[PDB]
Amino acid sequence: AMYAIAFNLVVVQEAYTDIGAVLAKFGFVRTQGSLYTNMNEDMANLFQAMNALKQLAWISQSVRDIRAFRIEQWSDFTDFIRN
Amino acid sequence: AMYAIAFNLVVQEAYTDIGAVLAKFGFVRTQGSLYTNMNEDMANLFQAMNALKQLAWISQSVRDIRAFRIEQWSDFTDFIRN
Numbered sequence: 001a002m003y004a005i006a007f008n009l010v011v012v013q014e015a016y017t018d019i020g021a022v023l024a025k026f027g028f029v030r031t032q033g034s035l036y037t038n039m040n041e042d043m044a045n046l047f048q049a050m051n052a053l054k055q056l057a058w059i060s061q062s063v064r065d066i067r068a069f070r071i072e073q074w075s076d077f078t079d080f081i082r083n
Numbered sequence: 084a085m086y087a088i089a090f091n092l093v094v095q096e097a098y099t100d101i102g103a104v105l106a107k108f109g110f111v112r113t114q115g116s117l118y119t120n121m122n123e124d125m126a127n128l129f130q131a132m133n134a135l136k137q138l139a140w141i142s143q144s145v146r147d148i149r150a151f152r153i154e155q156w157s158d159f160t161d162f163i164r165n
Contacts, residue, residue, distance in 0.1 A: 063164065069156045070154040074149060
């Protein structure tokens with residue numbers, strides 16, 4: 001299924017870099033904003049991504065809000081908008 | 084259900100004007116350039132997208148725009164902030 005991670009930071013580009021690096025290790029790529037998606041893997045993979053983030057000592061003081069969710073009915077409106 | 088709109092722009096700026104149109108159909112910016120509405124249906128999302136479409140300049144200045152349903156919305160803030 002399609003899993004997604006979205007967050008709010010308080011820190012910038014470096015933190016976004018280091019978080020993106022941890023998430024890339026589990027197939028989560030920045031798609032549209034501060035939204036990281038993985039269209040392939042399951043919940044165990046999402047949970048390993050979230051454990052890997054926890055490991056980063058500084059993330060608890062830089063992340064205000066972090067959401068993970070399943071995306072369904074992923075739909076492209078780019079053409080619907082470009083007329 | 085929970086619906087969301089995510090986009091990539093090229094040219095806070097006109098995030099204001101898109102956000103204003105989307106706020107009219109209950110879509111609020113929640114986490115980045117991600118606008119969410121927990122409440123309404125596909126018809127509401129549809130007229131939100133028509134409302135964007137009518138903006139003259141949005142064709143030049145949107146590269147990618149997705150809409151989708153969110154399920155299993157989960158809060159990992161406590162999970163992380165330990």
